[PDB]
Structure formats: C-alpha cells, structure tokens
Enzyme design. Sequence first.
Site, PDB file in Angstrom:
ATOM      1  CG  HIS A 146      -7.367   3.979  -3.652  1.00  0.00           C
ATOM      2  ND1 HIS A 146      -6.253   3.779  -4.422  1.00  0.00           N
ATOM      3  CD2 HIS A 146      -7.625   2.801  -3.053  1.00  0.00           C
ATOM      4  CE1 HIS A 146      -5.855   2.534  -4.294  1.00  0.00           C
ATOM      5  NE2 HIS A 146      -6.670   1.918  -3.468  1.00  0.00           N
ATOM      6  CG  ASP A 147      -5.327   2.386  -0.568  1.00  0.00           C
ATOM      7  OD1 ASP A 147      -6.142   2.098   0.324  1.00  0.00           O
ATOM      8  OD2 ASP A 147      -5.241   1.699  -1.614  1.00  0.00           O
ATOM      9  CG  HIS A 172      -2.036  -0.994   1.080  1.00  0.00           C
ATOM     10  ND1 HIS A 172      -2.154  -2.058   1.931  1.00  0.00           N
ATOM     11  CD2 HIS A 172      -3.068  -1.083   0.222  1.00  0.00           C
ATOM     12  CE1 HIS A 172      -3.211  -2.763   1.605  1.00  0.00           C
ATOM     13  NE2 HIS A 172      -3.786  -2.191   0.571  1.00  0.00           N
ATOM     14  CG  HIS A 219      -2.135  -0.080  -4.263  1.00  0.00           C
ATOM     15  ND1 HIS A 219      -2.831  -1.133  -4.797  1.00  0.00           N
ATOM     16  CD2 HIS A 219      -3.053   0.679  -3.629  1.00  0.00           C
ATOM     17  CE1 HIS A 219      -4.104  -1.027  -4.487  1.00  0.00           C
ATOM     18  NE2 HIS A 219      -4.270   0.064  -3.771  1.00  0.00           N
ATOM     19  CG  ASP A 262      -8.338  -1.261  -4.112  1.00  0.00           C
ATOM     20  OD1 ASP A 262      -7.190  -0.809  -4.305  1.00  0.00           O
ATOM     21  OD2 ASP A 262      -8.922  -1.185  -3.010  1.00  0.00           O
TER      22      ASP A 262
HETATM   23  C1  LIG Z   1      -2.136  -9.604  -5.158  1.00  0.00           C
HETATM   24  O1  LIG Z   1      -3.106 -10.321  -4.407  1.00  0.00           O
HETATM   25  C2  LIG Z   1      -3.909  -9.610  -3.559  1.00  0.00           C
HETATM   26  C3  LIG Z   1      -4.053  -8.236  -3.577  1.00  0.00           C
HETATM   27  C4  LIG Z   1      -4.899  -7.607  -2.683  1.00  0.00           C
HETATM   28  C5  LIG Z   1      -5.638  -8.349  -1.769  1.00  0.00           C
HETATM   29  C6  LIG Z   1      -6.546  -7.666  -0.813  1.00  0.00           C
HETATM   30  N1  LIG Z   1      -7.158  -8.429   0.018  1.00  0.00           N
HETATM   31  N2  LIG Z   1      -8.007  -7.835   0.920  1.00  0.00           N
HETATM   32  C7  LIG Z   1      -8.933  -8.870   1.477  1.00  0.00           C
HETATM   33  C8  LIG Z   1     -10.023  -9.213   0.480  1.00  0.00           C
HETATM   34  C9  LIG Z   1     -10.954 -10.272   1.025  1.00  0.00           C
HETATM   35  N3  LIG Z   1     -10.242 -11.469   1.501  1.00  0.00           N
HETATM   36  C10 LIG Z   1     -10.667 -12.739   1.181  1.00  0.00           C
HETATM   37  N4  LIG Z   1     -12.005 -12.800   1.233  1.00  0.00           N
HETATM   38  C11 LIG Z   1     -12.671 -13.937   0.940  1.00  0.00           C
HETATM   39  N5  LIG Z   1     -13.997 -13.908   1.002  1.00  0.00           N
HETATM   40  N6  LIG Z   1     -12.056 -15.089   0.605  1.00  0.00           N
HETATM   41  C12 LIG Z   1     -10.675 -15.085   0.535  1.00  0.00           C
HETATM   42  C13 LIG Z   1     -10.005 -16.275   0.180  1.00  0.00           C
HETATM   43  C14 LIG Z   1      -8.640 -16.303   0.117  1.00  0.00           C
HETATM   44  C15 LIG Z   1      -7.890 -15.153   0.394  1.00  0.00           C
HETATM   45  C16 LIG Z   1      -8.520 -13.990   0.736  1.00  0.00           C
HETATM   46  C17 LIG Z   1      -9.943 -13.927   0.817  1.00  0.00           C
HETATM   47  C18 LIG Z   1      -9.163 -11.180   2.448  1.00  0.00           C
HETATM   48  C19 LIG Z   1      -8.206 -10.146   1.891  1.00  0.00           C
HETATM   49  C20 LIG Z   1      -8.064  -6.493   1.233  1.00  0.00           C
HETATM   50  O2  LIG Z   1      -8.955  -5.974   1.871  1.00  0.00           O
HETATM   51  C21 LIG Z   1      -6.969  -5.680   0.607  1.00  0.00           C
HETATM   52  C22 LIG Z   1      -7.209  -4.167   0.686  1.00  0.00           C
HETATM   53  C23 LIG Z   1      -8.152  -3.681  -0.357  1.00  0.00           C
HETATM   54  C24 LIG Z   1      -8.489  -4.390  -1.415  1.00  0.00           C
HETATM   55  C25 LIG Z   1      -7.971  -5.760  -1.689  1.00  0.00           C
HETATM   56  C26 LIG Z   1      -6.740  -6.153  -0.841  1.00  0.00           C
HETATM   57  C27 LIG Z   1      -5.509  -9.739  -1.746  1.00  0.00           C
HETATM   58  C28 LIG Z   1      -4.640 -10.377  -2.627  1.00  0.00           C
HETATM   59  O3  LIG Z   1      -4.440 -11.734  -2.708  1.00  0.00           O
HETATM   60  C29 LIG Z   1      -4.933 -12.577  -1.671  1.00  0.00           C
HETATM   61 MG   LIG Z   2      -7.785   1.265   0.635  1.00  0.00          MG
HETATM   62 ZN   LIG Z   3      -6.030   0.352  -2.673  1.00  0.00          ZN
END
Ligand SMILES: COc1ccc(C2=NN(C3CCN(c4nc(N)nc5ccccc45)CC3)C(=O)[C@@H]3CC=CC[C@H]23)cc1OC
Ligand SMILES: [Mg+2]
Ligand SMILES: [Zn+2]
Length: 333
Positions: free
Chosen positions: A124-125, A84, A88, A237
């Site tokens: 945004h971040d 972040h 990004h 995102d």
């Molecule tokens: C490069 O690869 C990634 C980039 C960003 C993120 C991001 N992840 N997250 C979350 C999103 C929801 N998640 C999962 N949810 C559900 N239902 N199932 C899952 C199953 C397996 C793994 C995760 C989840 C948890 C993580 C944020 O909040 C970040 C901040 C803002 C946006 C996206 C970012 C994850 C990446 O790879 C895992």
């Molecule tokens: Mg954000």
């Molecule tokens: Zn972001």
Amino acid sequence: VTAITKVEREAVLVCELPSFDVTDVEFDLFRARESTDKPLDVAAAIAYRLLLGSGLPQKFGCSDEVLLNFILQCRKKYRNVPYHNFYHVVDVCQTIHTFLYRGNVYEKLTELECFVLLITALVHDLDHMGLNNSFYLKTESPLGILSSASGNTSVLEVHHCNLAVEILSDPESDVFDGLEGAERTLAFRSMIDCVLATDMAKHGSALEAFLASAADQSSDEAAFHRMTMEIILKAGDISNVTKPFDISRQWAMAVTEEFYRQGDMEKERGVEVLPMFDRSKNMELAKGQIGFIDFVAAPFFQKIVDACLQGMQWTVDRIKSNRAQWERVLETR
Ligand SMILES: COc1ccc(C2=NN(C3CCN(c4nc(N)nc5ccccc45)CC3)C(=O)[C@@H]3CC=CC[C@H]23)cc1OC
Ligand SMILES: [Mg+2]
Ligand SMILES: [Zn+2]
C-alpha cells in the site's frame, strides 16, 4: 528481479518473537523493533507469521516460500523514512487482521477478499518518500507531471500500484500465482482499487459511498464487498488513534517528524508550507491529535461501526479514551 535468497530468507525464519501475540488488538510493534538489533527481520517475521497463521495463503496455493519472498520483496521497496516505512505497512496488515478476526469483518467478505486485504496492506505505500501528493504537484516534480499529464491526481497511489504489480509478475514472489481466471482478476482488481482508495483526497467520497451501500439492502453485492475492502484498508491506515495511547503517541511522533521534513523541503524549494508541516511552531501534539480525532477519525470509525461494522466498537471506544487522555495533557499543562 533481484531474488531474495536464503541469506535474507532464513534471516527472518530464525526470529521467533516469544514475548508477543500478533493477533491481539494491543499488539505493540514499537516493543518488537526495540527488542532486537534486527528490527527489519522482526517486522517481516510478524507479517510472515500473521499471514501463515490465517491459513489463507495455503488455501490459495501460496506456499510459504513464495510468501516470504513477497514480504521481503516489499521490504526492499520501503525506504527509511520516519513514518511511511515498512513498520507502517506491517502495522496496517496486523491491524486489518484484528479488524477482520476480532471485529468479525471476515463475515462481510470472502476468504480470497480477506487474503487480498492482508496482502494489500503490505504493498500500500511501496517506495513512499516522506512526501505527500501535494508536494509533487506544487514542486512540479516529474512524478507530479506524469500524474497530471496522465489524468490521475493520486500521484503516490498509482506509484505504489505500479511497484506492487512489478513484484507480482515474478512467480517466485507472486502470492496470487495459484489463482486463475475470475479469481486472479478480482485479486488484482481489488488490490489496486483498495490502494487507490487510500488517497485522503477521496476520503469523504469513499466514506459516503460505503455508507449509502451499507444502508441499501439492494446494493449490488460485488460493489459492497469492494467498498468494504476499500473501507477496511482505509481503516487500517488511520488506525493509529485506535491503539493504546502509548502506541498511538509514538505513531504521532513519527508522522509529525515526517511532515516537518516535507515542510523543511517546501521552504527550500520556495513553495507553499501549511501550518501542520512547519517546525517553526512547536505545534502541540495534543491539539493535533485532538483535531485529527474530531474531524477525520472519530466520525469515520463511529459511522462505519454503526452502518455495518458492529464488531469494531472498540475502535470507537479507544478513540474516545485516547481523546480524553490528550484533554488531560491539556488540562494539566
Ligand atoms: C498518528 O497520527 C496521524 C497519522 C496519520 C495521519 C495522516 N494524515 N493525513 C492527512 C489526513 C487529513 N488531514 C486532516 N484533515 C482534516 N480534514 N482535518 C484535520 C485536522 C487536524 C489535522 C489533520 C487534518 C491532514 C493529514 C494523510 O493523508 C496521511 C497519509 C494517509 C493516511 C493518513 C495520514 C495523521 C495523523 O495525525 C494528525
Ligand atoms: Mg499511502
Ligand atoms: Zn499508509
């Protein structure tokens, strides 16, 4: 506040970035950083160039001078974290450009709205600190207390909006200074709305609301434009899995490091540590990305492409093929 100055200014203007086409869906920001001693001035130039090339700032009485001050004002606010960071948000801005101009999403919105989205990607971040909203609430951190007391669970997103507004009160860094009345209001309104919608806690509700609007020919038009801007910022995102595998993989290295570090801090503090945030498991990158693809990103992109955003079919195709490449890392291990 602060003031950018020619010293920093020119430090960006004298980057020409000859090897790449910033408009391409296969643009590689990892190369760009690697290809100089000044990766922060290169990233800025990519944003600068993307925005100027759209001819949107000019249209809305934003000179180049103010534009660059804005970008540079954002850059200072981004920190040095693994994921972040300012790379990004430059990525998000470049990706959103591709979704608008290669995916023909420009057709669903006004120019002001496309201009706001390109800008909003960059704010945004702002001042993200490697730590997710959960951490602030579980550590009863002062920002989590303020959010909890103030009635808004989106700890970071409100923070980023606060900083974004700051940057734009100063008219030498205010890219909306040429807007008046209803246009100026809309720019701020939608920018804030979009940023707030990047809270993944709201992901389901924002996807189901955009789809129900897209399937309804009588949907209020202003509300559809808004949800579309929100969906496009959200798309940028989670767009890391829509890139060429090698670019995708490096994004996933960066987040996996960032999560690990929060989880290190969650161990120290003594608070709850999720599996994903725990270095203690090697935690196969492959299976992480496959799950992220199956549960978050593939359904998301497939659904908005079908509902409405037919020009972006390539995102669904690259996810599909990035997935198959992770399955072949599994099959050969
Ligand atoms: C490069 O690869 C990634 C980039 C960003 C993120 C991001 N992840 N997250 C979350 C999103 C929801 N998640 C999962 N949810 C559900 N239902 N199932 C899952 C199953 C397996 C793994 C995760 C989840 C948890 C993580 C944020 O909040 C970040 C901040 C803002 C946006 C996206 C970012 C994850 C990446 O790879 C895992
Ligand atoms: Mg954000
Ligand atoms: Zn972001």
